Ligand binder design. Structure first.
Ligand code: COA
Ligand code: COA
Ligand code: MYR
Ligand code: MYR
Lengths: 377, 8, 379, 7
């Protein structure tokens, strides 16, 4: 059973929800002491400005973070990507919570939180997003993840925040929504060769390649890289566009500069400036390659795509073209927000991995993937 | 992401 | 008012019966700083740099608030300024100074710090605005609203659209009005420098009226320590629920605001026979520069901060506060008439002051409250 | 904020 998650303020796996609100009240006194690590390990707050700890953190994630179903690929988050994901506005070094071996100080554990204004049905609440929970392989199946969770929970409590958001590939108590990954092949030769995909039968490699053939320049009129001058309208666009869904982020203009302004190998944003000079739509997609075990699949991930005048269909087509042009092998989009209307039509394939969304210390009705409006790295 | 998926 | 009829505040005299904001949250915000008079530039002060910190200390020391009759001036210390301007969540952009381009001389400042504010039935993330200062040479050259519009913009960029701040002047529209009272500790010096006056009543009699016990009367009173932080936090939160305008501080903010620092903040807890902390008193350190008095330069003043009572009587708690201040060399102990401070001001022989303190909320429409319902003490 | 004195 769930011996750890039965002690937490989350709804049970089976209960249907009819209420809105916290599971437990905000705490007026918080444990000042770090939790106990098993004999031989200590806590450490990782200062990512130090390139040495940043690399240690990178080596740790590259060697021990998430793998797929058949243990064939592993995320290969880079230093600069981790700096982008772990230092958004309002980040804290204390929330970069690593575990080291007391004797040798080697990094063997990690969990992180970042602050985020979250809107859920009718409530806007200050929460945190929890990502990169990682424990070294030699240290699994012995209760370090629960301790990581309780220590980060404590450290969030100390700052006065009592709710969280996080995703997971595993079913826990209790998913607020279940989403599914779909993939659009860009370089099928490499994809079939490394077993990311397979020749769907009664078909050839040459026929397959002509299936995923794409145009070499985009369709939409007035597409260009996002620029500094665009931070206000993107923010505007996003804010209005996100009001239809039931679980969304609430970004200040700064968080928009951080999350969407383009960076080599990390995030790419393209805006649509029309004949009148008004930006009206934008697309976004980030860079996360996975190590090929037994050399490197390059993947682009749909982030936020806002449409007010260009059809989303064309916007995502041009996204596929842009990714193709930048040297990516595959384009992965979830099925949340309005993505169901273009996944089949643009020839995406369904993946085997699910993505469960969870709220910590918040009771609410679950939603269908179409109302989830949040994309985490 | 979190889920390392591939083509089903 | 020419400047405030443009801002999202209610008018003087319009009474309010709704609760909420005046103008919507901003979907797009100006990217460019407001225009300064020719020859001046904006600069975010890095207070970790001691030279910049020093600069900021001098600007306030020579140009900040004076009393009604222009005889005294605040002398915030550098370390005091770091405690007030670098609480948990501070941003270097919110330490917004104005410099002379030629010489880089600092001639303006205004700051914002983040703070969860509770008002009536609403908790919203706000900012506290303090230390609006314009060099005397630059007064009435229309620079203060430029500061205000610029700080408002920089707060807007971080997504916060409500603020709280105080002022000695009546603006549109006070959410509450408080009154300063001052308790003499060294009446000799206060009277010598014209801070107060003999009520005919002989000074020798006046000197023995404000004499205090050599030691505090409450049992188990001791300085606040690290192990007290959760229990202080607990005490403060529950105590603050009777007032209508309060801060909502995390345990981290309680560490920052109350853990004792010499010459900045003092906190004393009451640990009883069971070892349980049941009450605490606090007061921060802010001397004033006395001008053109040859032998009397600065008056050491203690300002009451947050005092919570659950078993010790508030009167006895504040009495021991007076005693502790006295022992430390304070000439005067100041308190506002907010929260429950009216219940003990006269009895401890404070006199009322001539300055008022208006509390204001920016972009928040609500009814005003009486001083007793105010539960916020700003720096 | 307000430098009041004895009235
Ligand atoms: C995530 C990871 C730290 C799990 O730790 P572990 O040492 O295998 O397992 P532990 O016994 O330590 O933890 C078990 C408990 O952790 C919690 N848990 C397990 N996986 C989790 C996850 N991804 N997120 C949050 N909690 C998780 C469960 O609630 C479980 O309690 P339960 O008994 O109620 O199920 C480890 O496998 C790892 O680092 N994985 C690489 C990255 C990864 O897999 N990330 C999350 C995968 S969904
Ligand atoms: C306060 C101070 C900065 C005023 O700046 P200034 O340049 O003289 O004033 P300006 O030229 O901008 O005068 C116009 C506006 O300043 C405003 N102003 C002056 N002092 C103010 C204060 N403490 N808070 C808010 N606004 C203030 C007025 O509200 C006025 O707007 P209005 O026309 O709608 O009333 C200056 O007198 C000073 O340094 N005093 C010390 C700090 C203080 O007293 N508070
Ligand atoms: C949302 C941000 C609003 C910031 C501006 C609020 C109004 C400022 C008035 C000046 C306050 C002076 C207080 C002292 O110093
Ligand atoms: C995927 O890397 C991270 C694991 C998800 C953690 C489970 C939820 C923990 C919430 C912790 C903080 C809660 C603060 C209120």
């Amino acid at each position: 059973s769930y011996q750890f998650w039965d002690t937490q303020p989350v709804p049970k796996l089976g209960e249907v929800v009819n209420t809105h609100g916290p599971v437990e009240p905000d705490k007026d006194n918080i444990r000042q002491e770090p939790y106990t690590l098993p004999q031989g390990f200590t806590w450490d707050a990782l200062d990512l400005g130090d390139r040495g700890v940043l690399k240690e953190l990178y080596t740790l994630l590259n060697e021990n973070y998430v793998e797929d179903d058949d243990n064939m690929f592993r995320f290969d988050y880079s230093p600069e990507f981790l700096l982008w994901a772990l230092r958004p506005p309002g980040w804290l070094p204390q929330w970069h919570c690593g575990v080291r071996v007391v004797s040798s100080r080697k990094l063997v554990g990690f969990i992180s939180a970042i602050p985020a204004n979250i809107h859920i049905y009718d409530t806007e609440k200050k929460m945190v997003e929890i990502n990169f929970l990682c424990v070294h392989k030699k240290l699994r199946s012995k209760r370090v993840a629960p301790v990581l969770i309780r220590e980060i929970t404590r450290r969030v409590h100390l700052e006065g925040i009592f709710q969280a958001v996080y995703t997971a590939g595993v079913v826990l108590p209790k998913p607020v929504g279940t989403c599914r990954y779909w993939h659009r092949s860009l370089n099928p030769r490499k994809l079939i060769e490394v077993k990311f995909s397979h020749l769907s039968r009664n078909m050839t490699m040459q026929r397959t390649m002509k299936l995923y053939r794409l145009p070499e320049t985009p369709k939409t009129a007035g597409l260009r890289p996002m620029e500094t001058k665009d931070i206000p309208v993107v923010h505007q666009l996003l804010t209005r566009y996100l009001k239809q869904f039931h679980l969304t982020p609430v970004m200040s203009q700064e968080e928009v500069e951080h999350w969407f302004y383009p960076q080599e190998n990390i995030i790419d944003t393209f805006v649509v400036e029309n004949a009148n000079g008004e930006v009206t739509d934008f697309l976004s997609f980030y860079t996360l390659p996975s190590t090929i075990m037994n050399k490197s699949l390059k993947a682009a991930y749909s982030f936020y795509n806002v449409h007010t005048q260009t059809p989303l269909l064309d916007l995502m087509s041009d996204a596929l073209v842009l990714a193709k042009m930048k040297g990516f092998d595959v384009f992965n989009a979830l099925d949340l927000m309005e993505n169901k209307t273009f996944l089949e039509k643009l020839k995406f394939g369904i993946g085997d991995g699910n993505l469960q969304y969870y709220l910590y210390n918040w009771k609410c009705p679950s939603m269908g993937a179409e109302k989830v409006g949040l994309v985490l790295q | 992401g979190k889920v390392l998926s591939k083509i089903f």
